[PDB]
Scaffold this active site. Structure first.
Site, PDB file in Angstrom:
ATOM      1  N   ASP A 117      -4.537  -2.113 -18.766  1.00  0.00           N
ATOM      2  CA  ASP A 117      -5.831  -2.370 -19.718  1.00  0.00           C
ATOM      3  C   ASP A 117      -6.858  -1.485 -19.085  1.00  0.00           C
ATOM      4  OD1 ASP A 117      -5.020  -4.289 -21.273  1.00  0.00           O
ATOM      5  OD2 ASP A 117      -5.018  -5.955 -19.991  1.00  0.00           O
ATOM      6  N   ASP A 144       9.947  14.597   5.447  1.00  0.00           N
ATOM      7  CA  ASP A 144       9.647  15.879   4.964  1.00  0.00           C
ATOM      8  C   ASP A 144       8.344  16.177   4.157  1.00  0.00           C
ATOM      9  OD1 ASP A 144      11.880  16.739   6.338  1.00  0.00           O
ATOM     10  OD2 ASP A 144      13.109  16.697   4.418  1.00  0.00           O
TER      11      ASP A 144
END
Lengths: 263, 263, 292, 266, 292, 292
Positions: free
Chosen positions: C17, C94
């Protein structure tokens, strides 16, 4: 607080000492502005004041070797100067309620360091100068402005700072005995001997502009009486740059004689 | 109170313990943020601090088995997390007025859990990680910021919460010995052994962000001295849905060191 | 309620919404879709755990019961797992280092016909947290050990009291929140494909059931968020056809690491909107356990 | 919070020379006691798994933290950073200077990892894990890239939303730890402390890491005076010698957001 | 010149200072930095090839010469290579499928002192393209083969006439362009770590020198862009200290594939700005070969 | 800030750019100049001690180190030493009796070329004070003794943390202050040409290094001021030419003795300017450790 705001080091000198004195004695207690040596005492045979034969014994504050070195030429290796703001004495008994007998008396004494001189017939004959703690004569008799109570309640008190603005001395290195070594007691004007004892364990590093509170713990015979002794001291230190003390540093910001131990 | 208002469980941890210690001992008392184990003590031969040979003994709070299970893999079966708000210690003597001798000393110690590592030469050789309670070193010597009084009056005090907002850990299951089993004492950095004892009876379930108050009850010989010990603890709990604890749940709403026992 | 504030709220409250911190954070709009079917005579639990990469999982137990030790069941991935979490168990650091959750919001929208459905959707709360457990093991010489464990999983073994239990066709829609009062980091773990880990027996940790992951490069748990785990039960009795389209929409505030091109999508975190704290800390618990 | 804490301005002062023809990093990390973190690699290329690393301590590391693996508990319990900052000041003349200084941030953290252990009876085990040193593996786009002769000066700020007292963890020798293979961990490189009586990693703060790249070329006499200091808060133990020295807003974060990456040292 | 138009121009012309297609494209601001030193008595070429992931490379030849067959030299990566191009040679398609170049813009900003520098920066153009080459090989039975090859590399073997050749302290700054008149896709290749590939001899393709890549997970060439390869020569004679801070700033318009979280950073491509075509197709060649 | 007040401030703060006492004080503007060179591979410390007559001294230690017991090094004189302090060791009281310091301000202005300089200027603080030390000596009969000693010299053996460390060409400029809160007298000592004095061993006082004076009529220390000793390090590595023009500008408020003609240059001290106390006790520590 004062008008100065340089790099200072605050410290709280909080001492825990359980004490158990011999009955039939006069346990005498000095709390003098001596940094790192929070406590000063001697015992004399009962009824009497200190005499010439009073050989004095300190205890140190825990951790004294760390910030004042070990040797008599090593007392200013971390701090160059210091100050004083307040000291507290506290005696709280650890004794039950039927064996006791005794009294506790508290006045102040204005003791200060001074320099007495005397000529020594050497070859060639000269004169010298030694340190002495004048003012100590007032301990030997009854000061009228005092506190007076039995043993069983106890006593708490605080000192005062005898200067309008809070100026300061320096660390006085060297001192292990007062009067110093090879100097006789009666030559100086010290009635009773002051001694620090073992060099590496403790020692007088300096002096502050404070009152010295003195305690006459009176003890008759047959009364086993033990207590805790508590020394607080609002102690300042001005450190050296080589010292590790700099990661504590910040800037300084711009009652009658005694009461009993239950406030 | 704080900014959070979820489903919480309040609890008051009110402990009654009459105590009678052996004369000529050093009754040492820890009140640590350990949920369900309100009390921590050990006795050492007199005059001395805890040593390496100090084998530690808890007592539990009454009703510990009910909300933390019985087994070392069962310590989080009713609550998933908790908190802390306040703890209180209270010692009130049950002793008459002529046999007594002793002292009571109270400071705080910042003890916290940590993880020390060490490599173990197995086949193949590895390394591991164990829990340890660092901060415990400060118990072994005289803290200056303390309380000091004899035995006969007693002491009441409260702790503090060392965090700006009141964040939280979790329950750490598993712990029965600190250092754990098959790990030597000197490897971790714990000078004195911490132990919970019998698994089903008690055990460390977790830890909170609080100060730990430590008590040095000093006891000379010949002085039979008994007291009540009183632990209050403002303890919170965050429960589980399977637990029965939900019909207690509502939403959370949006002094110096110590004093003597007579206030 | 400034311009980032309601943007934080619409991220938090209903994508159908922050605080005093102003670092370069990356905001992923985790938007996930599954068209998924169930099986008759088979209680399908659902777990929405605060685990980045795994927005969703449904657990399966035979009819009219609760999970066992043998209830050992998997994750899925919201897409983006190979990209932002690597492929090996020592490669999740990483891209990103720590994460925050603004909200995760779940909704189940059924697509079954009106002449066949039977069962219920039952939703409650489980405050699941990651903890540790120690135990000695026989080694040479004898040693202790220390591995992770999930506490709060014990709560899943029964229906929660504060629940939302209606028909299968009515659907469900729910919200979570951060139960600890400031948006705390959680550093990203690695090596976790097995909860409990390898060579560790159930009953030695306290978990009544097992989270597995299977393959290394396709799934895994990277950490834990300070969020309560939403649990949804569908019992699916004998005789019913049971299919639905499910939603898992989440807002994740990452803390990246200066390697990989992502950073430009993130921006500096906006300064404090102290008023808009009160809108988040009032409306979410004013919304019930679940809605339609 | 307002309780008995220790303020300790910890300063390293030294000159430094740079190795000619090599790429040399300095990591300003939140590892208290240790002043900074340095190693060198060949010029133009980057540190790898085969790249070893070294500490440089603050003065007085053994004084406040002891010497052994069972010694860092003794004086302070937990700690927290407030503001630490580095300054390089050039001492190479106008006749020899070459190379540059490039500055970028790296938000690294300390986590854990698990791994299966192949023993009999087998278990798994957990070791500590520097998460984020993968982020050091490139040059971040927030750049202060500038040739050596003007120097550099830069501060950091707390990367946490506000602050926590972080504990002193004890017993860290290398990161990844001893008796543990690097490939099972996932760090880019090994972060050693050496003999523990000399140096050790005692804990982790709520700060990012400032990495500076100075690659002096061949024949480049590169030398400087390094100034790196910190403002750390400590929670001490009552037995400590440090304990006696102890004592009991929004503009800081406006500084934290609007700061440039660095500034010229002139 | 609409709002995306000059935004396209400032992406194209100077990040230091589209068409009829309207798909969901992702625009990375490739911003790269190297502080890099050279060596005395050593001619360092530089190649800026249109290769995503590799924004930059410098080639090295001994003094006063040109490359040989033995001149076999590497790439670097602009960061973002492990994230958006995977780790294995059959994994580059995981994130993106084709790419476009808006521009790549190179600049070299020296940091050497005024009392030591010697040499030159020499910049010209090389229209390098990717092609094929066939040749029979002895097999069982005898067969033909077909591999890639790069045409236009022959141009690198000599200094271009339209050049920019000044002192080492003056620096250089340059721009490229799309030499074919519409922004054409280029599908992303895989398996390319060796140009020419394995078991293929130089002189059998036509390349006078070799592009290598080395490790699989750390470098590689993924495709080719419709851009001319900018070539920069620094000769670096004997006796000079030679260091600089180099720039490689590029604009890349990717075409992704619906797996990985990236897509929200991209948007739908803006509609035609037909006027702003004329600003791109006039100013870029009005700018010279190179400037300061 | 009255008319003497800013005149006190410009004396105090920057000669390059009192209290309730109203006696006949003499204000010397101590203005000193040295064109002085250093030596390569030789760490030259500098000490600016609060000693009237000696505004300046530089100490010398071999490279990369700190002073030893053998580091025994001299004063210079700001001119005016033969006039206002006599010629013999029992003659310093002839002119003045006590002194005060308003400020001493040091600055180093280098004159070296830009192609040769190397090293650093490192400046910090050392609160050095004059104290006593007692020790027994073998005499006939055995006695004690008491001589001066300087405490705080221990701090010089390491670089101060709060410092100012930049290149050699940048220069330095610094200020001191009175660390005790009122302007206290210091009575002028005599006989001091040796610190520690004759027949006194180092290590028996606590000084790690020696202040000498040499000749009686040309140099000497006359007392000590309530000022912190500014310490400046120049390391001067191997290969650099190292010369500069140094400044030592001080304000000294003397207390004379009615002999010698000086007095007319002094006047009665001005009355209190209580506001202008706050300008001195705020700005000096607002200025840092050192500036350019």
């Amino acid at each position: 607080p004062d008008r100065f705001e340089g790099k200072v080091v605050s410290r709280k000198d909080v001492l825990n000492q359980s004490i158990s004195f011999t009955a039939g004695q006069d346990t005498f207690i000095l709390i003098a502005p001596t940094p790192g040596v929070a406590y000063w005492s001697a015992s004399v045979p009962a009824g009497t004041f200190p005499t010439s034969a009073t050989t004095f014994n300190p205890v140190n504050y825990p951790g004294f070797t760390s910030m004042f070195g070990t040797t008599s030429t090593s007392r200013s290796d971390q701090v160059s100067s210091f100050r004083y703001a307040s000291m507290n004495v506290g005696i709280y008994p650890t004794s039950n309620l039927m064996q006791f007998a005794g009294s506790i008396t508290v006045w102040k004494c204005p003791v200060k360091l001074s320099t007495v001189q005397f000529p020594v017939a050497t070859d060639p004959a000269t004169s010298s100068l030694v340190h002495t703690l004048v003012g100590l004569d007032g301990v030997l008799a009854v000061g009228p402005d005092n506190f007076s109570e039995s043993f069983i309640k106890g006593v708490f008190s605080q000192s005062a700072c005898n200067e309008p603005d809070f100026e300061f001395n320096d660390i006085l290195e060297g001192i292990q005995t007062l009067p110093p070594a090879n100097v006789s007691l009666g030559s100086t004007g010290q009635p009773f001997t002051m001694d620090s004892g073992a060099e590496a364990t403790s020692g007088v590093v300096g002096w502050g502009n404070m009152d010295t509170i003195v305690i006459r713990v009176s003890a008759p015979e047959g009364a086993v009486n033990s207590a805790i002794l508590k020394a607080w001291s609002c102690i300042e230190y001005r450190p050296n740059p080589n010292a590790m003390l700099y990661q504590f540093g910040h800037d300084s910001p711009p009652l009658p004689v005694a009461v009993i131990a239950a406030q």
